[PDB]
Write a protein that binds this DNA or RNA. Structure first.
Ligand SMILES: [Zn+2]
Lengths: 136, 125, 134, 38, 94
RNA sequence: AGCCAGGAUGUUGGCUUAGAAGCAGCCAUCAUUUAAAGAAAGCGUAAUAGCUCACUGGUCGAGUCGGCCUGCGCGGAAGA
Protein backbone atom coordinates (compact mmCIF):
# COMPACT_ATOMS: atom_id res chain seq x y z
CA UNK A 1 0.00 0.00 0.00
CA UNK A 2 1.79 2.99 -1.43
CA UNK A 3 3.27 5.69 0.79
CA UNK A 4 6.34 7.98 0.61
CA UNK A 5 9.50 6.32 1.93
CA UNK A 6 10.60 9.46 3.65
CA UNK A 7 9.37 13.07 3.62
CA UNK A 8 10.62 16.57 4.29
CA UNK A 9 7.71 17.34 6.58
CA UNK A 10 5.36 15.14 8.54
CA UNK A 11 2.12 17.05 8.03
CA UNK A 12 0.43 19.21 5.42
CA UNK A 13 -2.07 21.99 4.67
CA UNK A 14 -5.45 20.75 3.58
CA UNK A 15 -4.99 22.67 0.39
CA UNK A 16 -7.48 22.82 -2.37
CA UNK A 17 -8.14 20.72 -5.37
CA UNK A 18 -8.72 23.07 -8.28
CA UNK A 19 -8.15 23.29 -12.05
CA UNK A 20 -7.40 20.40 -14.40
CA UNK A 21 -5.00 17.48 -14.68
CA UNK A 22 -1.55 16.98 -16.12
CA UNK A 23 -0.68 13.69 -17.86
CA UNK A 24 -3.94 13.49 -19.77
CA UNK A 25 -2.51 10.97 -22.20
CA UNK A 26 -1.45 7.37 -22.24
CA UNK A 27 2.35 7.36 -22.56
CA UNK A 28 3.21 3.70 -21.82
CA UNK A 29 0.37 1.24 -22.32
CA UNK A 30 -2.13 0.93 -25.16
CA UNK A 31 -5.04 1.66 -22.83
CA UNK A 32 -5.71 3.72 -19.75
CA UNK A 33 -8.26 4.51 -17.08
CA UNK A 34 -8.87 8.25 -17.04
CA UNK A 35 -10.74 10.15 -14.31
CA UNK A 36 -13.65 12.34 -15.36
CA UNK A 37 -14.50 13.61 -11.85
CA UNK A 38 -12.40 15.32 -9.18
CA UNK A 39 -11.48 13.70 -5.85
CA UNK A 40 -8.97 12.35 -3.36
CA UNK A 41 -7.60 8.82 -3.73
CA UNK A 42 -6.48 7.10 -0.60
CA UNK A 43 -3.74 4.55 -0.97
CA UNK A 44 -6.24 1.88 0.07
CA UNK A 45 -8.46 2.69 -2.87
CA UNK A 46 -5.61 2.54 -5.35
CA UNK A 47 -4.35 -0.74 -3.94
CA UNK A 48 -7.72 -2.50 -3.89
CA UNK A 49 -8.26 -1.35 -7.45
CA UNK A 50 -4.87 -2.45 -8.76
CA UNK A 51 -5.71 -5.81 -7.19
CA UNK A 52 -9.06 -5.99 -8.96
CA UNK A 53 -7.57 -5.44 -12.41
CA UNK A 54 -4.68 -7.82 -11.54
CA UNK A 55 -7.14 -10.66 -10.94
CA UNK A 56 -8.91 -9.61 -14.14
CA UNK A 57 -5.94 -10.07 -16.49
CA UNK A 58 -4.81 -13.35 -14.94
CA UNK A 59 -1.45 -11.68 -14.33
CA UNK A 60 -0.78 -11.12 -18.05
CA UNK A 61 0.04 -7.98 -20.05
CA UNK A 62 1.25 -5.07 -17.98
CA UNK A 63 -0.16 -2.54 -15.52
CA UNK A 64 1.20 0.89 -14.62
CA UNK A 65 -0.06 3.07 -11.85
CA UNK A 66 0.41 6.66 -12.80
CA UNK A 67 -0.83 8.21 -9.55
CA UNK A 68 0.85 8.43 -6.22
CA UNK A 69 -0.63 9.15 -2.77
CA UNK A 70 1.96 11.63 -1.52
CA UNK A 71 -0.06 13.97 0.69
CA UNK A 72 -0.74 13.01 4.36
CA UNK A 73 -4.16 13.41 5.95
CA UNK A 74 -4.67 13.74 9.66
CA UNK A 75 -7.51 12.98 12.04
CA UNK A 76 -8.08 13.74 15.69
CA UNK A 77 -9.70 10.67 17.31
CA UNK A 78 -13.15 10.61 18.91
CA UNK A 79 -14.06 12.59 22.02
CA UNK A 80 -11.26 15.15 21.60
CA UNK A 81 -11.84 18.92 21.74
CA UNK A 82 -10.59 21.38 19.17
CA UNK A 83 -7.07 22.70 19.34
CA UNK A 84 -4.18 21.13 21.21
CA UNK A 85 -2.35 20.96 17.90
CA UNK A 86 -2.88 19.27 14.56
CA UNK A 87 -4.26 15.75 14.36
CA UNK A 88 -2.16 12.62 13.92
CA UNK A 89 -1.36 11.26 10.51
CA UNK A 90 -3.99 8.73 9.47
CA UNK A 91 -3.36 7.90 5.87
CA UNK A 92 -2.15 9.08 2.51
CA UNK A 93 -3.92 10.40 -0.50
CA UNK A 94 -3.39 11.53 -4.09
CA UNK A 95 -5.17 14.64 -5.32
CA UNK A 96 -7.08 13.88 -8.53
CA UNK A 97 -8.26 16.47 -11.03
CA UNK A 98 -10.47 15.82 -13.97
CA UNK A 99 -8.49 14.16 -16.75
CA UNK A 100 -5.70 12.41 -14.91
CA UNK A 101 -4.78 8.92 -16.03
CA UNK A 102 -4.90 6.58 -13.09
CA UNK A 103 -3.70 3.33 -14.62
CA UNK A 104 -2.15 2.32 -17.86
CA UNK A 105 -2.23 -1.05 -19.45
CA UNK A 106 -1.10 -3.05 -22.45
CA UNK A 107 -0.16 -6.46 -23.83
CA UNK A 108 -3.84 -7.39 -23.66
CA UNK A 109 -7.00 -7.68 -25.84
CA UNK A 110 -9.04 -4.48 -25.78
CA UNK A 111 -12.32 -6.05 -24.78
CA UNK A 112 -10.69 -7.69 -21.77
CA UNK A 113 -9.13 -4.33 -20.82
CA UNK A 114 -12.41 -2.41 -20.86
CA UNK A 115 -13.64 -5.17 -18.59
CA UNK A 116 -10.75 -5.12 -16.14
CA UNK A 117 -11.10 -1.36 -15.95
CA UNK A 118 -14.77 -1.53 -15.17
CA UNK A 119 -13.88 -3.90 -12.31
CA UNK A 120 -11.08 -1.59 -11.20
CA UNK A 121 -13.32 1.48 -11.22
CA UNK A 122 -15.92 -0.25 -9.04
CA UNK A 123 -13.40 0.38 -6.23
CA UNK A 124 -12.88 4.05 -6.92
CA UNK A 125 -14.74 7.04 -5.47
CA UNK A 126 -14.67 9.12 -8.67
CA UNK A 127 -16.16 9.17 -12.17
CA UNK A 128 -13.91 7.40 -14.68
CA UNK A 129 -13.70 6.42 -18.36
CA UNK A 130 -11.80 4.20 -20.71
CA UNK A 131 -9.23 5.64 -23.15
CA UNK A 132 -6.79 4.65 -25.91
CA UNK A 133 -3.34 6.08 -26.58
CA UNK A 134 -3.16 8.01 -29.87
CA UNK A 135 -0.55 9.00 -32.40
CA UNK A 136 0.17 12.62 -31.42
CA UNK B 1 -21.90 -14.35 -43.37
CA UNK B 2 -21.30 -13.60 -47.05
CA UNK B 3 -20.05 -10.26 -48.42
CA UNK B 4 -21.18 -9.08 -51.89
CA UNK B 5 -17.70 -10.08 -53.14
CA UNK B 6 -18.26 -13.58 -51.65
CA UNK B 7 -21.61 -13.94 -53.48
CA UNK B 8 -20.02 -12.58 -56.71
CA UNK B 9 -17.16 -15.11 -56.69
CA UNK B 10 -19.55 -17.98 -55.87
CA UNK B 11 -21.91 -16.95 -58.74
CA UNK B 12 -18.77 -17.10 -60.92
CA UNK B 13 -17.98 -20.71 -59.72
CA UNK B 14 -21.53 -22.00 -60.27
CA UNK B 15 -21.66 -20.25 -63.70
CA UNK B 16 -18.16 -21.71 -64.45
CA UNK B 17 -19.07 -25.38 -63.70
CA UNK B 18 -22.48 -24.77 -65.40
CA UNK B 19 -20.75 -23.80 -68.67
CA UNK B 20 -18.45 -26.84 -68.39
CA UNK B 21 -21.20 -29.30 -67.41
CA UNK B 22 -23.07 -31.56 -69.82
CA UNK B 23 -26.28 -31.97 -67.80
CA UNK B 24 -27.87 -30.85 -64.52
CA UNK B 25 -30.54 -31.95 -62.01
CA UNK B 26 -32.28 -29.63 -59.47
CA UNK B 27 -33.80 -31.26 -56.35
CA UNK B 28 -35.13 -30.66 -52.83
CA UNK B 29 -32.40 -31.16 -50.17
CA UNK B 30 -34.71 -30.89 -47.10
CA UNK B 31 -35.16 -33.50 -44.38
CA UNK B 32 -32.07 -35.61 -44.93
CA UNK B 33 -29.12 -36.31 -42.61
CA UNK B 34 -25.50 -35.22 -43.41
CA UNK B 35 -24.60 -38.96 -43.27
CA UNK B 36 -26.71 -39.89 -46.32
CA UNK B 37 -25.66 -36.59 -47.96
CA UNK B 38 -21.91 -37.42 -47.57
CA UNK B 39 -23.05 -40.86 -48.94
CA UNK B 40 -24.41 -39.18 -52.11
CA UNK B 41 -21.23 -37.01 -52.15
CA UNK B 42 -19.11 -40.23 -52.27
CA UNK B 43 -21.54 -41.67 -54.85
CA UNK B 44 -21.10 -38.21 -56.43
CA UNK B 45 -17.26 -38.02 -56.70
CA UNK B 46 -17.44 -41.63 -57.88
CA UNK B 47 -19.90 -40.78 -60.75
CA UNK B 48 -18.05 -37.59 -61.78
CA UNK B 49 -20.93 -35.56 -60.34
CA UNK B 50 -20.48 -32.05 -58.88
CA UNK B 51 -22.89 -31.64 -55.94
CA UNK B 52 -24.08 -28.30 -54.57
CA UNK B 53 -26.61 -26.59 -52.32
CA UNK B 54 -26.68 -22.91 -53.45
CA UNK B 55 -28.82 -19.81 -52.75
CA UNK B 56 -31.77 -19.28 -55.05
CA UNK B 57 -31.41 -15.63 -56.08
CA UNK B 58 -27.69 -16.47 -56.50
CA UNK B 59 -28.56 -19.30 -58.90
CA UNK B 60 -30.74 -16.95 -60.98
CA UNK B 61 -27.56 -14.87 -61.48
CA UNK B 62 -25.38 -17.93 -62.21
CA UNK B 63 -28.01 -19.68 -64.45
CA UNK B 64 -28.54 -16.43 -66.35
CA UNK B 65 -25.16 -17.69 -67.66
CA UNK B 66 -27.04 -19.96 -70.13
CA UNK B 67 -28.55 -22.35 -71.29
CA UNK B 68 -30.13 -23.41 -67.98
CA UNK B 69 -32.51 -20.38 -67.80
CA UNK B 70 -35.52 -22.75 -68.09
CA UNK B 71 -34.66 -23.70 -64.45
CA UNK B 72 -35.28 -20.26 -62.86
CA UNK B 73 -38.75 -21.30 -61.63
CA UNK B 74 -37.24 -24.54 -60.24
CA UNK B 75 -35.36 -22.41 -57.71
CA UNK B 76 -38.43 -21.79 -55.53
CA UNK B 77 -37.88 -24.15 -52.62
CA UNK B 78 -34.52 -25.41 -51.21
CA UNK B 79 -32.11 -26.09 -54.08
CA UNK B 80 -29.61 -28.98 -54.43
CA UNK B 81 -28.11 -29.21 -57.93
CA UNK B 82 -26.16 -32.10 -59.42
CA UNK B 83 -23.96 -31.13 -62.37
CA UNK B 84 -22.44 -34.12 -64.15
CA UNK B 85 -19.21 -32.72 -65.59
CA UNK B 86 -18.24 -36.26 -66.62
CA UNK B 87 -20.99 -37.98 -68.69
CA UNK B 88 -24.57 -36.78 -68.96
CA UNK B 89 -26.92 -38.86 -66.78
CA UNK B 90 -25.46 -40.47 -63.59
CA UNK B 91 -27.02 -37.53 -61.69
CA UNK B 92 -30.65 -38.22 -62.80
CA UNK B 93 -30.32 -42.02 -62.39
CA UNK B 94 -28.57 -41.58 -58.95
CA UNK B 95 -31.10 -39.03 -57.54
CA UNK B 96 -34.32 -41.02 -58.24
CA UNK B 97 -32.83 -44.07 -56.49
CA UNK B 98 -31.54 -41.88 -53.61
CA UNK B 99 -35.02 -40.23 -53.17
CA UNK B 100 -36.73 -43.64 -53.43
CA UNK B 101 -34.11 -45.03 -50.99
CA UNK B 102 -34.72 -42.19 -48.48
CA UNK B 103 -38.39 -41.50 -49.40
CA UNK B 104 -37.69 -37.91 -48.29
CA UNK B 105 -37.58 -34.68 -50.34
CA UNK B 106 -38.57 -34.43 -54.01
CA UNK B 107 -36.14 -34.11 -56.96
CA UNK B 108 -38.33 -31.57 -58.87
CA UNK B 109 -37.09 -30.42 -62.34
CA UNK B 110 -34.15 -31.29 -64.65
CA UNK B 111 -32.46 -29.50 -67.57
CA UNK B 112 -30.84 -30.90 -70.73
CA UNK B 113 -30.23 -29.58 -74.30
CA UNK B 114 -31.46 -26.17 -73.09
CA UNK B 115 -34.92 -27.40 -72.03
CA UNK B 116 -36.50 -28.31 -68.67
CA UNK B 117 -37.69 -31.86 -67.96
CA UNK B 118 -40.83 -32.32 -65.71
CA UNK B 119 -40.49 -34.63 -62.64
CA UNK B 120 -41.95 -37.95 -63.97
CA UNK B 121 -40.12 -37.68 -67.33
CA UNK B 122 -36.59 -37.31 -65.80
CA UNK B 123 -36.54 -41.08 -66.53
CA UNK B 124 -35.32 -39.84 -69.97
CA UNK B 125 -32.02 -39.28 -68.11
CA UNK C 1 -28.62 -48.37 -32.20
CA UNK C 2 -25.48 -48.12 -29.99
CA UNK C 3 -21.67 -47.96 -30.35
CA UNK C 4 -18.74 -49.08 -28.17
CA UNK C 5 -14.93 -49.59 -28.47
CA UNK C 6 -14.02 -53.13 -27.33
CA UNK C 7 -10.50 -54.69 -26.96
CA UNK C 8 -9.50 -57.23 -29.65
CA UNK C 9 -10.55 -60.79 -28.68
CA UNK C 10 -12.40 -59.59 -25.59
CA UNK C 11 -15.90 -59.20 -24.17
CA UNK C 12 -18.28 -59.59 -21.14
CA UNK C 13 -16.85 -57.53 -18.25
CA UNK C 14 -19.62 -55.71 -16.27
CA UNK C 15 -18.62 -51.96 -16.40
CA UNK C 16 -17.55 -51.60 -20.16
CA UNK C 17 -20.11 -53.74 -22.18
CA UNK C 18 -22.93 -55.70 -20.43
CA UNK C 19 -25.14 -52.90 -18.91
CA UNK C 20 -24.52 -50.30 -21.72
CA UNK C 21 -26.03 -52.41 -24.56
CA UNK C 22 -27.83 -54.77 -22.11
CA UNK C 23 -30.44 -52.18 -21.08
CA UNK C 24 -31.32 -52.05 -24.85
CA UNK C 25 -32.68 -55.64 -25.05
CA UNK C 26 -29.56 -57.19 -26.62
CA UNK C 27 -28.47 -60.78 -25.85
CA UNK C 28 -25.02 -60.22 -24.25
CA UNK C 29 -23.04 -63.45 -24.98
CA UNK C 30 -23.82 -63.67 -28.75
CA UNK C 31 -22.46 -60.12 -29.22
CA UNK C 32 -19.54 -61.02 -26.91
CA UNK C 33 -18.27 -64.24 -28.59
CA UNK C 34 -19.32 -63.57 -32.21
CA UNK C 35 -17.34 -60.29 -31.72
CA UNK C 36 -14.38 -62.26 -30.32
CA UNK C 37 -14.90 -64.70 -33.25
CA UNK C 38 -14.84 -61.76 -35.76
CA UNK C 39 -12.16 -59.66 -34.01
CA UNK C 40 -9.92 -62.61 -33.07
CA UNK C 41 -7.97 -61.23 -36.12
CA UNK C 42 -7.40 -57.76 -34.53
CA UNK C 43 -4.08 -57.65 -32.61
CA UNK C 44 -4.25 -58.07 -28.80
CA UNK C 45 -4.49 -54.77 -26.90
CA UNK C 46 -6.11 -52.59 -29.59
CA UNK C 47 -9.62 -51.36 -28.83
CA UNK C 48 -11.69 -51.97 -32.05
CA UNK C 49 -14.94 -49.97 -32.54
CA UNK C 50 -18.14 -51.98 -32.91
CA UNK C 51 -21.46 -50.52 -34.14
CA UNK C 52 -24.40 -52.49 -32.71
CA UNK C 53 -27.70 -52.28 -34.64
CA UNK C 54 -30.77 -53.36 -32.57
CA UNK C 55 -34.27 -53.94 -34.03
CA UNK C 56 -37.75 -54.17 -32.41
CA UNK C 57 -37.27 -58.00 -32.10
CA UNK C 58 -33.86 -57.73 -30.18
CA UNK C 59 -32.03 -59.65 -32.93
CA UNK C 60 -29.04 -57.41 -33.67
CA UNK C 61 -26.55 -56.98 -36.49
CA UNK C 62 -23.22 -55.30 -35.69
CA UNK C 63 -20.61 -53.93 -38.07
CA UNK C 64 -17.22 -54.27 -36.46
CA UNK C 65 -15.15 -51.49 -38.05
CA UNK C 66 -11.38 -50.97 -38.20
CA UNK C 67 -9.45 -49.91 -35.02
CA UNK C 68 -9.46 -46.15 -34.19
CA UNK C 69 -7.16 -43.49 -35.69
CA UNK C 70 -5.76 -43.06 -32.14
CA UNK C 71 -5.19 -46.84 -31.58
CA UNK C 72 -3.50 -47.49 -34.98
CA UNK C 73 -1.38 -44.33 -34.18
CA UNK C 74 -0.53 -45.76 -30.73
CA UNK C 75 0.65 -48.98 -32.47
CA UNK C 76 2.32 -47.53 -35.64
CA UNK C 77 4.51 -45.15 -33.55
CA UNK C 78 5.25 -48.12 -31.28
CA UNK C 79 3.89 -46.36 -28.19
CA UNK C 80 1.36 -47.27 -25.45
CA UNK C 81 -0.28 -43.99 -24.33
CA UNK C 82 -0.19 -40.83 -26.48
CA UNK C 83 0.57 -37.35 -25.10
CA UNK C 84 -1.05 -35.73 -22.08
CA UNK C 85 0.34 -32.52 -23.64
CA UNK C 86 -0.10 -32.93 -27.50
CA UNK C 87 2.28 -30.97 -29.85
CA UNK C 88 3.79 -29.46 -26.65
CA UNK C 89 5.04 -32.86 -25.44
CA UNK C 90 5.38 -35.28 -28.42
CA UNK C 91 5.31 -39.06 -27.64
CA UNK C 92 6.23 -41.02 -30.83
CA UNK C 93 6.78 -41.14 -34.63
CA UNK C 94 5.26 -42.44 -37.93
CA UNK C 95 6.63 -42.15 -41.52
CA UNK C 96 4.05 -41.40 -44.32
CA UNK C 97 3.79 -45.19 -45.07
CA UNK C 98 2.09 -45.77 -41.65
CA UNK C 99 -0.17 -42.73 -42.14
CA UNK C 100 -1.12 -44.48 -45.42
CA UNK C 101 -1.58 -48.02 -43.84
CA UNK C 102 -3.72 -46.66 -40.99
CA UNK C 103 -5.49 -44.63 -43.75
CA UNK C 104 -6.11 -47.76 -45.86
CA UNK C 105 -7.65 -49.45 -42.76
CA UNK C 106 -9.57 -46.19 -42.33
CA UNK C 107 -9.95 -45.94 -46.18
CA UNK C 108 -12.37 -48.73 -45.34
CA UNK C 109 -13.48 -46.53 -42.32
CA UNK C 110 -13.46 -42.80 -43.58
CA UNK C 111 -15.57 -40.28 -45.58
CA UNK C 112 -12.46 -39.26 -47.57
CA UNK C 113 -12.16 -38.77 -51.33
CA UNK C 114 -8.58 -40.01 -51.78
CA UNK C 115 -6.03 -41.85 -49.60
CA UNK C 116 -4.60 -38.28 -49.19
CA UNK C 117 -7.87 -37.24 -47.49
CA UNK C 118 -7.78 -40.31 -45.23
CA UNK C 119 -3.99 -39.80 -44.72
CA UNK C 120 -4.83 -36.18 -43.78
CA UNK C 121 -7.57 -37.23 -41.30
CA UNK C 122 -5.02 -39.68 -39.81
CA UNK C 123 -2.67 -36.62 -39.97
CA UNK C 124 -5.20 -34.73 -37.87
CA UNK C 125 -5.43 -37.58 -35.31
CA UNK C 126 -1.58 -37.62 -35.50
CA UNK C 127 -1.48 -33.96 -34.32
CA UNK C 128 -4.28 -34.61 -31.76
CA UNK C 129 -2.44 -37.03 -29.43
CA UNK C 130 0.96 -35.35 -29.91
CA UNK C 131 2.69 -37.89 -32.21
CA UNK C 132 5.27 -36.66 -34.76
CA UNK C 133 5.01 -37.61 -38.50
CA UNK C 134 8.47 -38.55 -39.86
CA UNK D 1 -37.29 -12.00 -5.95
CA UNK D 2 -33.98 -10.24 -5.54
CA UNK D 3 -35.03 -6.73 -4.79
CA UNK D 4 -32.29 -4.24 -5.43
CA UNK D 5 -31.12 -1.02 -6.96
CA UNK D 6 -28.92 -2.60 -9.57
CA UNK D 7 -30.71 -5.22 -11.70
CA UNK D 8 -29.13 -7.15 -14.55
CA UNK D 9 -29.35 -10.00 -17.06
CA UNK D 10 -27.82 -13.06 -15.44
CA UNK D 11 -28.03 -15.22 -18.57
CA UNK D 12 -29.26 -15.15 -22.17
CA UNK D 13 -32.87 -16.02 -21.23
CA UNK D 14 -33.37 -13.08 -18.87
CA UNK D 15 -35.53 -10.31 -20.33
CA UNK D 16 -35.83 -6.81 -18.96
CA UNK D 17 -39.24 -5.16 -18.52
CA UNK D 18 -40.79 -1.99 -17.15
CA UNK D 19 -44.13 -2.80 -15.54
CA UNK D 20 -46.06 -0.06 -13.84
CA UNK D 21 -42.96 2.09 -13.62
CA UNK D 22 -40.81 -0.61 -12.07
CA UNK D 23 -37.85 -2.23 -13.76
CA UNK D 24 -37.85 -5.98 -13.36
CA UNK D 25 -35.89 -8.82 -14.84
CA UNK D 26 -37.90 -11.84 -15.91
CA UNK D 27 -36.62 -15.29 -16.67
CA UNK D 28 -38.30 -18.29 -18.23
CA UNK D 29 -35.38 -20.56 -17.31
CA UNK D 30 -34.28 -19.71 -13.84
CA UNK D 31 -36.78 -18.59 -11.13
CA UNK D 32 -33.71 -17.44 -9.18
CA UNK D 33 -33.13 -14.60 -11.66
CA UNK D 34 -36.47 -12.96 -10.94
CA UNK D 35 -35.75 -9.42 -9.88
CA UNK D 36 -37.39 -6.18 -9.03
CA UNK D 37 -35.94 -2.74 -8.54
CA UNK D 38 -36.15 -1.19 -5.07
CA UNK E 1 -6.85 12.03 -49.04
CA UNK E 2 -8.41 14.39 -46.47
CA UNK E 3 -10.03 17.70 -47.33
CA UNK E 4 -10.94 20.06 -44.54
CA UNK E 5 -13.13 23.08 -45.11
CA UNK E 6 -12.46 26.17 -43.08
CA UNK E 7 -13.11 29.84 -42.49
CA UNK E 8 -10.82 32.69 -41.55
CA UNK E 9 -11.14 33.84 -37.95
CA UNK E 10 -12.38 37.41 -37.54
CA UNK E 11 -11.82 37.25 -33.77
CA UNK E 12 -9.35 36.04 -31.17
CA UNK E 13 -8.71 35.33 -27.53
CA UNK E 14 -10.37 33.23 -24.88
CA UNK E 15 -13.88 34.58 -25.45
CA UNK E 16 -13.90 34.05 -29.21
CA UNK E 17 -12.54 30.53 -28.70
CA UNK E 18 -15.14 29.49 -26.18
CA UNK E 19 -18.01 30.84 -28.30
CA UNK E 20 -16.46 28.84 -31.15
CA UNK E 21 -16.42 25.70 -29.01
CA UNK E 22 -20.00 26.30 -27.84
CA UNK E 23 -21.15 26.50 -31.50
CA UNK E 24 -19.67 23.04 -32.23
CA UNK E 25 -16.75 24.59 -34.09
CA UNK E 26 -13.12 24.91 -33.05
CA UNK E 27 -10.02 27.12 -33.62
CA UNK E 28 -6.80 25.96 -35.29
CA UNK E 29 -3.81 27.55 -36.91
CA UNK E 30 -1.68 27.36 -40.04
CA UNK E 31 1.94 28.47 -39.83
CA UNK E 32 5.37 27.57 -41.10
CA UNK E 33 7.02 28.65 -44.27
CA UNK E 34 7.90 32.08 -45.62
CA UNK E 35 4.33 33.31 -45.07
CA UNK E 36 2.43 34.77 -42.16
CA UNK E 37 0.27 32.66 -39.85
CA UNK E 38 -3.37 32.01 -40.75
CA UNK E 39 -5.90 31.38 -37.95
CA UNK E 40 -8.96 29.44 -38.97
CA UNK E 41 -12.03 27.69 -37.60
CA UNK E 42 -13.32 24.21 -38.35
CA UNK E 43 -16.28 21.87 -37.80
CA UNK E 44 -15.56 19.80 -34.72
CA UNK E 45 -17.39 16.74 -35.99
CA UNK E 46 -15.89 16.39 -39.47
CA UNK E 47 -12.36 16.64 -38.18
CA UNK E 48 -13.05 14.53 -35.07
CA UNK E 49 -14.17 11.70 -37.34
CA UNK E 50 -11.28 12.43 -39.74
CA UNK E 51 -8.46 12.16 -37.17
CA UNK E 52 -10.28 8.99 -36.14
CA UNK E 53 -7.91 7.54 -38.74
CA UNK E 54 -4.14 7.31 -38.21
CA UNK E 55 -2.89 8.62 -41.58
CA UNK E 56 -4.31 12.05 -40.69
CA UNK E 57 -1.19 12.52 -38.58
CA UNK E 58 1.36 11.10 -41.06
CA UNK E 59 0.06 12.71 -44.25
CA UNK E 60 -0.26 15.79 -46.42
CA UNK E 61 -3.82 17.08 -46.29
CA UNK E 62 -5.57 20.07 -47.79
CA UNK E 63 -7.53 22.90 -46.30
CA UNK E 64 -10.09 24.86 -48.30
CA UNK E 65 -10.09 28.47 -47.18
CA UNK E 66 -12.03 31.11 -49.14
CA UNK E 67 -11.75 29.19 -52.43
CA UNK E 68 -8.06 28.57 -51.79
CA UNK E 69 -6.41 25.34 -50.69
CA UNK E 70 -3.29 25.02 -48.62
CA UNK E 71 -1.35 21.79 -48.21
CA UNK E 72 -0.36 21.04 -44.61
CA UNK E 73 0.57 18.41 -42.01
CA UNK E 74 -0.71 17.83 -38.47
CA UNK E 75 1.82 19.30 -36.03
CA UNK E 76 0.34 19.01 -32.54
CA UNK E 77 -3.15 18.88 -31.20
CA UNK E 78 -4.49 19.76 -27.76
CA UNK E 79 -7.52 17.80 -26.64
CA UNK E 80 -10.09 18.60 -23.96
CA UNK E 81 -9.07 16.76 -20.79
CA UNK E 82 -11.78 14.12 -20.32
CA UNK E 83 -14.09 14.70 -23.27
CA UNK E 84 -14.01 13.11 -26.74
CA UNK E 85 -13.10 16.57 -28.04
CA UNK E 86 -10.50 18.78 -29.73
CA UNK E 87 -9.43 22.11 -28.32
CA UNK E 88 -7.01 22.95 -31.09
CA UNK E 89 -4.65 22.00 -33.91
CA UNK E 90 -1.29 23.26 -35.02
CA UNK E 91 -0.96 22.96 -38.79
CA UNK E 92 2.45 23.23 -40.34
CA UNK E 93 2.72 24.23 -44.01
CA UNK E 94 3.61 21.25 -46.19
C1' A F 1 -37.22 -11.66 -35.65
C1' G F 2 -40.38 -15.86 -36.49
C1' C F 3 -41.47 -20.47 -38.63
C1' C F 4 -39.57 -25.69 -42.03
C1' A F 5 -34.80 -28.45 -42.46
C1' G F 6 -29.90 -30.16 -41.30
C1' G F 7 -26.03 -29.20 -36.82
C1' A F 8 -21.83 -34.52 -40.36
C1' U F 9 -16.64 -38.51 -40.54
C1' G F 10 -11.82 -39.73 -38.33
C1' U F 11 -13.63 -40.24 -33.10
C1' U F 12 -15.08 -42.40 -27.35
C1' G F 13 -8.62 -36.77 -30.32
C1' G F 14 -4.80 -38.09 -26.52
C1' C F 15 -4.04 -37.50 -21.26
C1' U F 16 -6.72 -39.18 -16.66
C1' U F 17 -10.21 -42.08 -14.45
C1' A F 18 -13.95 -47.96 -11.68
C1' G F 19 -16.25 -44.23 -15.98
C1' A F 20 -14.64 -38.50 -19.36
C1' A F 21 -17.68 -40.69 -25.08
C1' G F 22 -17.89 -32.11 -27.38
C1' C F 23 -19.56 -31.06 -22.27
C1' A F 24 -14.85 -33.63 -14.01
C1' G F 25 -10.10 -32.37 -14.87
C1' C F 26 -5.09 -31.50 -18.39
C1' C F 27 -3.27 -30.47 -23.27
C1' A F 28 -3.70 -30.07 -28.29
C1' U F 29 -8.11 -28.25 -31.36
C1' C F 30 -6.37 -30.82 -36.77
C1' A F 31 -8.12 -32.94 -41.14
C1' U F 32 -12.17 -34.88 -44.09
C1' U F 33 -17.52 -34.71 -46.83
C1' U F 34 -19.05 -29.58 -46.81
C1' A F 35 -24.81 -25.31 -48.06
C1' A F 36 -23.10 -25.31 -43.24
C1' A F 37 -21.59 -28.29 -38.62
C1' G F 38 -16.91 -25.18 -32.38
C1' A F 39 -12.25 -32.02 -31.18
C1' A F 40 -18.33 -27.77 -29.07
C1' A F 41 -22.04 -22.60 -26.19
C1' G F 42 -25.55 -24.86 -22.16
C1' C F 43 -29.21 -28.97 -19.77
C1' G F 44 -28.20 -34.11 -19.36
C1' U F 45 -25.67 -39.54 -17.91
C1' A F 46 -22.40 -44.12 -13.28
C1' A F 47 -20.12 -42.87 -18.35
C1' U F 48 -23.51 -42.81 -22.68
C1' A F 49 -27.88 -41.82 -24.74
C1' G F 50 -31.32 -37.73 -24.84
C1' C F 51 -32.17 -31.64 -25.53
C1' U F 52 -31.00 -26.61 -27.76
C1' C F 53 -26.91 -23.42 -29.45
C1' A F 54 -22.73 -21.68 -32.96
C1' C F 55 -23.37 -22.36 -38.64
C1' U F 56 -26.00 -22.97 -43.13
C1' G F 57 -30.29 -23.88 -47.09
C1' G F 58 -35.57 -22.77 -47.37
C1' U F 59 -40.23 -19.31 -46.46
C1' C F 60 -40.72 -14.07 -45.52
C1' G F 61 -40.42 -9.27 -47.45
C1' A F 62 -37.83 -3.57 -46.07
C1' G F 63 -35.25 -1.58 -43.43
C1' U F 64 -32.30 -3.52 -38.92
C1' C F 65 -27.91 -3.72 -35.21
C1' G F 66 -25.09 -1.08 -31.07
C1' G F 67 -22.04 2.05 -29.63
C1' C F 68 -20.68 7.68 -29.13
C1' C F 69 -22.39 12.77 -27.83
C1' U F 70 -25.98 15.48 -25.54
C1' G F 71 -31.81 17.63 -23.70
C1' C F 72 -35.76 16.29 -20.16
C1' G F 73 -37.54 12.38 -17.13
C1' C F 74 -37.60 6.77 -14.00
C1' G F 75 -35.69 3.58 -10.01
C1' G F 76 -31.86 4.05 -5.90
C1' A F 77 -35.48 7.24 -1.77
C1' A F 78 -37.49 4.82 5.70
C1' G F 79 -39.38 8.18 11.52
C1' A F 80 -41.63 9.45 15.12
ZN1 LIG G 1 -31.87 -16.14 -16.57
Amino acid sequence: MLQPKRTKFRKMHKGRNRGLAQGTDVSFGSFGLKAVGRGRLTARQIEAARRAMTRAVKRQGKIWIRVFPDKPITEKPLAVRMGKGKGNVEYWVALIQPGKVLYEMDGVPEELAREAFKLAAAKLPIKTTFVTKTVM
Amino acid sequence: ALNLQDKQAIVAEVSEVAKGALSAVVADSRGVTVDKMTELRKAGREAGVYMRVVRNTLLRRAVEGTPFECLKDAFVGPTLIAYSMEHPGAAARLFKEFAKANAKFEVKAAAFEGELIPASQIDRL
Amino acid sequence: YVKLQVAAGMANPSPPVGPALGQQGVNIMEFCKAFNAKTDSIEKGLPIPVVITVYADRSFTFVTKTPPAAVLLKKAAGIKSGSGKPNKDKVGKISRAQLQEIAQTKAADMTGADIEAMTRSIEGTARSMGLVVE
Amino acid sequence: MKVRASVKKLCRNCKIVKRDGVIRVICSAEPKHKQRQG
Amino acid sequence: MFTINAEVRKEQGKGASRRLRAANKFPAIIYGGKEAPLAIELDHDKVMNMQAKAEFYSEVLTIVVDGKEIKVKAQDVQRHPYKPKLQHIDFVRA
